Amino acid sequence: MKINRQQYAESYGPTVGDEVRLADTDLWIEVEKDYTTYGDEVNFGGGKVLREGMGENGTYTRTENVLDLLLTNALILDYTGIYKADIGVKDGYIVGIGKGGNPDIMDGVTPNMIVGTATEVIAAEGKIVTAGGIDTHVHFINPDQVDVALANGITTLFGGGTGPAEGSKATTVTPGPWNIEKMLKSTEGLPINVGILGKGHGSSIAPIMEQIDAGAAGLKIHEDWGATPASIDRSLTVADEADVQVAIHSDTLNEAGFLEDTLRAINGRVIHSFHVEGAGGGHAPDIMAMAGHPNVLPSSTNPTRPFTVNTIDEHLDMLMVCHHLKQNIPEDVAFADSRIRPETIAAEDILHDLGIISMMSTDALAMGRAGEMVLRTWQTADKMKKQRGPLAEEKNGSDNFRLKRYVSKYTINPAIAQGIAHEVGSIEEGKFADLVLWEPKFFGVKADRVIKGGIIAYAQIGDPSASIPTPQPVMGRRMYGTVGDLIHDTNITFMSKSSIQQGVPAKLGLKRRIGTVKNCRNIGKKDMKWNDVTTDIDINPETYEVKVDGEVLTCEPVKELPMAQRYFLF
């Protein structure tokens, strides 16, 4: 007996060779392989397969290869591939990617993916499943920012801040032992994974280091605190001892040095370069030249992504209003004009497409949108396909190569850069079960269900008083993973090795899972999945033209984007 492909895909989600459009973009992803056994697909419901004696095993105890949760029929989009599989979760972690069910009567069942009495089922047929987004440029300014991030599929926030204090409104910094301890305590009630950055500023080691020992997971060097050679140097020395990452927003003003001076202070050490294009901050006008170096892990923030006809106007004014600039004072305007450049923003689209900028991030509430990292990543990929055509490396009509290059920017690469990719950042066996389900029509726009540590934390769901959950109004809502003590077991506080060894979690009464920051001083640009290109980026000091391999990198701004007015109420 045979099933035609259209019918197959409607029932079980797509299978090998089938393609799916991402939202209302022009981008197509193709199923590369499928772990199922045709005819023994898992599914749940009345008269369906996962029933006792059938696709559900009625013999094994939980410990005997039985799952806590099976996501059936997922279309996985990840750096590791675009393929169809069942996903098995146990103790909060992804334990199996393969074929789930009952070995009694089914062929091809992954041995530790038994559906038993202990197993919960999530039907992923017809959905795209990705890792939770890793946002490594977060300002902790307003607690309402967390649902905003969860609704666009972000599950980890790395950054700093104490709320709406001017230090935190400008810089991703939680300064000093006491602020760090207070924000670790605050973090106990935020339904998302968190890592806190201390102030990467000082001329003595101790003041910096004590922040790491208190529980910070890394450091931020920002020009508003003095992004000087000394502060860069001391932070990187602390980082190299502590095994944590340093992010940098360099000296825009070129006050103590030009880009080459900042690079000489860095001295070959590993560093994460935030908003590398430089509209978000950085040596004017040539900070984006950092993205060509081997020891730099480069990210963009999102308001420049991608280059649109309103981008410059909105930035020029944004910059003026947050710096209290005046169009009357000539220096103020020369400053704005040196910082907000059409030439570098256009080239940032193309550096993303080439794999030269490895990561995306938000800059949430400081100069970036908390719920648009995922959104703008895909809008950028879509714009580049239209302007540059499919990358040479593509297949059929698939955009699979570009899709793995771009999903990597907000999942695995940020995790790698921050020393937390043993726990999060990709759909792989042995990693925390932070998983986002998307309807294809809403892909990258609004997440269906966000799973945190193997329990749903956030969902687009309807009237709580109705007979069923689908009646209006359907809106993003916190789920049971966020309630009571469950918020501790489904989320991770990422901390330095020294704060963990010193018993900070116990000193402060932290109940959240504690994740260890590690392995981030011996990585480089070569470790950025699908985005590992090192090259000589030239930024002309007079015209701000960007050249890579002797060619000018230019593209036009677009008037319209997908994943925009078809979806949003405002």
């Binding site: 007996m1 459009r21 004696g53 009625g58 070995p103 009567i105």
Partner: protein, 122 residues
């Protein structure tokens, strides 16, 4: 070219289910006065007692229908269905408690079925 957000573009061809497994066609009759609907993956010899068919032919088999679908028998309806072979370890536990072990034990399964009145044992 009209954009349907999230639409599929499926490849050409058909998907063959339960490929390379032996198929068997049998006649089954619902001798009861209420409707019986049977799922794809229930061990076929352990279905409702009132379904009359050669019970030996259900052993170690299930319906050869798309995973998660079911065959329906109205009161008094007789029709042919096609079965396919169970896979994996070819063991069945629970359900109607007729097998509880290997499906190779046909005489034991048929003895339990006959004693409990599952219609159609020789």
């Amino acid at each position: 070219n009209y954009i349907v957000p999230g639409e599929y573009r499926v490849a050409e061809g058909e998907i063959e289910i339960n490929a390379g497994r032996e198929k068997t066609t049998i006649r089954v009759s619902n001798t009861g006065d209420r409707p019986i609907q049977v799922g794809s993956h229930i061990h076929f010899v352990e279905v409702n007692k009132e379904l009359l068919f050669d019970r030996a032919e259900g052993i170690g088999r299930r319906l050869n229908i798309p995973s998660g679908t079911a065959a329906r028998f109205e009161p008094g309806e007789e029709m042919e269905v096609e079965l396919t072979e169970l896979g994996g370890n070819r063991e069945v536990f629970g359900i109607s408690d007729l097998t509880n072990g290997s499906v190779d034990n046909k005489e034991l399964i048929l003895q339990r079925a006959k004693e409990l009145g599952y219609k159609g044992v020789e």
